[PDB]
Amino acid sequence: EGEVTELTPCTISHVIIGLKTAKGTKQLKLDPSIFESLQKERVEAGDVIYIEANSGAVKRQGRCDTYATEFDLEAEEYVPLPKGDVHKKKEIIQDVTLHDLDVANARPQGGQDILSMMG
Amino acid sequence: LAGNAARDNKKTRIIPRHLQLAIRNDEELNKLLGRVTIAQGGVLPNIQAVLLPKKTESHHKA
Amino acid sequence: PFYLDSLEEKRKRQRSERLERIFQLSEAHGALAPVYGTEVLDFCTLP
Amino acid sequence: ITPGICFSTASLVLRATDVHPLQRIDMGRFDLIGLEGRVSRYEADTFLP
Amino acid sequence: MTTLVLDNGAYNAKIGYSHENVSVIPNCQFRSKTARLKTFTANQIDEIKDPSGLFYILPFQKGYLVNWDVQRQVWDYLFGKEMYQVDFLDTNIIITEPYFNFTSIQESMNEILFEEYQFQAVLRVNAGALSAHRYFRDNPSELCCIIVDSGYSFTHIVPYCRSKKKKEAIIRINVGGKLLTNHLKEIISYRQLHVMDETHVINQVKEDVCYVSQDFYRDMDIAKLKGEENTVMIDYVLPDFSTIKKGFCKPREEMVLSGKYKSGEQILRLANERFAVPEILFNPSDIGIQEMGIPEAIVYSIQNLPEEMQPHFFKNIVLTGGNSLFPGFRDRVYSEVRCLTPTDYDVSVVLPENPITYAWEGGKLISENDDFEDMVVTREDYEENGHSVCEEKF
Amino acid sequence: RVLDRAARQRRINRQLEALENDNFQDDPHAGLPNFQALLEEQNLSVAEGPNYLTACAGPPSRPQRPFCAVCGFPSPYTCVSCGARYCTVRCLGTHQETRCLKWTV
Ligand SMILES: Nc1ncnc2c1ncn2[C@@H]1O[C@H](COP(=O)(O)OP(=O)(O)OP(=O)(O)O)[C@@H](O)[C@H]1O
């Protein structure tokens, strides 16, 4: 987590993303397969975003706080800058039910052609 | 209107001041009494608060 | 001549963590086997 | 053509009820339907092991 | 040995013998209607019983010497007749200079700067180099450092490696003590108690109550309402010089929120300048100067090509200069540079105990340790080598 | 009417210049009764490479704060006359009566 500072897509071999937080900045090689999602979120230098190391669940929280008022009127969220360590590794011991798993495996996912009808 | 002006000025007895203020504040009464002048009356005043945040006495020999 | 032993140690440790992470994620994504796969359906899938 | 489009309203607290990245478990390790059209029987039975 | 060390900052000439003469002497002249014709020298201002309405004949224009007359008289006074003596070998005067110079400012020295006070190793070296030398002396294990010389005219960001000025990556954002003082003057004047005449006592408000806010928007939201803890209503008494000769913020117990002080003093201060003015260093371009802040520049120093040198640079940030001592300045700079710097790199900020005389202490250490037989440029060499030897050594 | 953009830029430049006028900001009389030149000494032959010309920081990345020109508080508004921002209607009035197309500060 952190304010994305720069995207440098290296047929993409990989895309480096710099995430800024109150405790510093870090550069990550970001599995160009999820550059699709990166573009889907329209994220670019300045935004605060999440990304999950397991699947690439990039989530745009909005623009940074310091970039507010760049346009005295603009429909934005301007989420505060994260204060913790950009590298957020923490264990989740939460439990799930077996019927929840069954339901999650009952119907497919995706809108390949008309399968969007599942939403 | 004169009583309203007097209560706004914190007075009980209506005076030419209040009559002038009421006549010149209302849109239609002023149109009706534009030519009229009132004794011991006055024109609408301006506020002096504008002097404070522009210039005042400095610390020089204060 | 500029060198920082602590920085090299931190970089090596984070690189080891990185390799362990990628190995874990690669092993965790291919542990599930399909119920039918793809050749089974293509076989049963008539025109 | 009525311009009186029905216009519901509610706080965003009612929409962020299901978002907590560092508190949700990864269900990708248990899904089976997604593997039907992506993964092959041979890929899992012979090659990967 | 009667050696000497000299700093000629635009705000104040920090000079004196190497025997701990750090005494801080203003580097300009003064005139006032209470002083119709007497043009008081550097420290003669103390003779003025009423320094109200002083006019500053200063030889500096945006940090560069100009008209050469105020400095001439100040030197003839300090080092010529009274406080210090002139001698061809005793006073080992070392001089400070801006980080950029030209043949005319201090290189051409025919009977000027080479006048009767000479010695073997005349040094006209930037104050940044002296500060870096002192730092490395009190920090021997360090290889490089970034000096933040928050002076009157500039706040220079200059890297060093124990001798070497990294000229390729130095920045001097136009914001300085002069701009801060003048902006405070105008802000006070065009809101209440028009006293923008003097770079004087309002300069005291610039030092007595000014502080850098840790959270600017938070202190602002606390200031937008009357009677809160932030004490935006500083209620700074203006000195009339008939009852008091220096202003000061009234204690919190004597606050009159209605401003109707029965003492007769003009106290109607409610605005946020007291912490909005110090904030100009960190986020400029809010007043209009399209420049970067000092943390933004400390980080833009990433332009230093060698990567292995950046983690050594980031650990030796020195916040010297007179303006660096605002309450809350060092920690604010640290917070701003820590988030911008990589998470894996270490950041260590240091603020000298006396960031104004730090350069003078560095000059003292230079004198009393070495630089008498080497790195020398004498008038005898200038007479034989002219401008060449001076620019060669510096 | 409305003022142009040249006037606003000239106002900004002149205010920044006044912010460095040290002798006397408004009225440098205070009594009239080796003489090197001004900053022109080098400002007339500005060199290249590392120097006070290239030593400038440049434009910042953080957007400008919308702060009021009257009281110094946040200003989500902007006056049409000279662009000077203001916080409330009271601020706009105090501005128009002190700064407008006719007056600068
Ligand atoms: N106690 C204090 N609180 C706040 N500010 C202070 C204090 N003491 C000094 N200052 C500020 O420090 C400044 C002095 O800076 P200094 O003289 O070190 O710069 P300089 O060496 O002249 O720089 P240059 O050589 O570029 O002109 C003054 O403008 C003053 O406003």
3-state helix/strand/coil string of E170-232: CECCCCCHHHHHHHHHHHHHCCCCCCCCCCCCHHHHHHHCCCCCCCHHHHHHHHCCCCCCCCC
Within 10 A of E329 (CB to CB), how many other CB atoms are there?
A: 24
Q: Tokens 């900045």 map to which residue? A: A25
**Distance, CA of B19 to CA of B42 (rounded, Å):** 10
Burial E174-195 (b: 16+ CB within 10 A, else e): bbbbbbbbbbbbbbbbbbbbbb
Residue E295: in which H helix or E strand, if any?
helix E294-300
| Alpha-carbon separation of residue B55 from B49, E265, E306, E368 (angstroms) | 11, 15, 56, 54
**Distance, CA of F56 to CA of F38 (rounded, Å):** 20
List, in sequence order, every residue forming a beta bridge with E31; answer none if it has no partner: E55
Q: Which atom of ligand 1 is nearest to the CA of E176?
A: 29
> How many angstroms away from the CA of E202 is the closest CA of chain A?
31
Q: Do C2 and E344 touch (CB under 8 A)?
A: no
**Distance, CA of A19 to CA of A17 (rounded, Å):** 6
Instruction: Please indicate whether chains B and E are in contact, defined as at least 3 beta carbon pairs under 8 Å.
Output: yes
Contact E291, F58 (CB under 8 A): yes
Burial class of E271 by CB neighbour count within 10 A (0 to 12, 13 to 18, 19+): buried
**Distance, CA of A12 to CA of E352 (rounded, Å):** 50
**Distance, CA of E387 to CA of E394 (rounded, Å):** 11
Q: Tokens 């408004």 map to which residue? A: F26
**Distance, CA of E299 to CA of E341 (rounded, Å):** 7
Within 10 A of E394 (CB to CB), how many other CB atoms are there?
A: 18
Contact E97, E104 (CB under 8 A): no
Return the structure tokens found at A35: 């550059």
Closest Cα to residue E358, out of E162, E100, E128? Answer: E128
Contact E54, E94 (CB under 8 A): no
List, in sequence order, every residue forming a beta bridge with E160; answer none if it has no partner: E145, E165
List, in sequence order, every residue forming a beta bridge with E15; answer none if it has no partner: E6
Burial class of E125 by CB neighbour count within 10 A (0 to 12, 13 to 18, 19+): buried
Residues in contact with ligand 1 (CB, 6 Å cut-off): E 9-12, 63, 151-154, 177, 203, 206-207, 210, 321-323, 325-326, 356
**Distance, CA of E24 to CA of B17 (rounded, Å):** 65
Instruction: Please indicate whether chains B and D are in contact, defined as at least 3 beta carbon pairs under 8 Å.
Output: no
Residue to mutate, E5, E6, E11, E202, ligand 1, most ligand atoms under 8 Å from C-beta: E11
User: What is the torsional sign of CA E292, E297, E299, E303?
Assistant: positive
Method of elucidation? cryo-EM
Task: Answer left, alpha or beta for residue E32, where phi above 0 means left and psi between -120 and 50 means alpha.
Answer: beta
**Distance, CA of A70 to CA of C19 (rounded, Å):** 41
| A66 CB-near residues (< 8 Å, 6+ apart) | A81, F62, F63
Question: Using alpha carbons only, what angle is made at residue C3 by residues C2 and C6, rounded to the nearest 5 degrees?
Answer: 150
Q: Tokens 């970001």 map to which residue? A: A30
List, in sequence order, every residue forming a beta bridge with E194; answer none if it has no partner: none
> How many angstroms away from the CA of E187 is the closest CA of chain C?
48
* Declared resolution, Å: 3.2
**Distance, CA of E368 to CA of E360 (rounded, Å):** 12
Contact E114, E390 (CB under 8 A): no
Judged by a CB distance cut-off of 8 A, whether residue C44 touches chain D is no
Contact A91, A31 (CB under 8 A): no
List, in sequence order, every residue forming a beta bridge with E318; answer none if it has no partner: E147, E350
Contact C14, A24 (CB under 8 A): no
Q: What is the second-level CATH architecture of the domain A1-104?
A: Beta Barrel (2.40)
| Alpha-carbon separation of residue E151 from E16, E157, E175, E330, F105 (angstroms) | 19, 11, 10, 15, 28
Three-state DSSP at A2 gives: strand
Question: Using alpha carbons only, what angle is made at residue E160 by residues E158 and E164, rounded to the nearest 5 degrees?
Answer: 115
Torsion, Cα of B20, B24, B26, B28 (10° steps): 110
Three-state DSSP at E381 gives: helix
- Cα D36 to its chain centre, rounded Å, is 17
List, in sequence order, every residue forming a beta bridge with E17; answer none if it has no partner: E4
Residue E296 phi/psi, 5-degree rounding, is -55, -35
Judged by a CB distance cut-off of 8 A, whether residue C5 touches chain E is no
Question: Using alpha carbons only, what angle is made at residue E191 by residues E188 and E194, rounded to the nearest 5 degrees?
Answer: 60
- Cα(E177) to ligand 1 centroid in Å equals 6
Within 10 A of E61 (CB to CB), how many other CB atoms are there?
A: 21
Residues across chain B = 62
> How many angstroms away from the CA of A53 is the closest CA of chain C?
9
Contact E249, E234 (CB under 8 A): yes
Question: Using alpha carbons only, what angle is made at residue E177 by residues E174 and E179, rounded to the nearest 5 degrees?
Answer: 60
Return the structure tokens found at E40: 């008081």
* Residues of E in Cβ contact (< 8 Å) with A67: none
Contact E365, E133 (CB under 8 A): yes
Rg (CA), chain D: 22
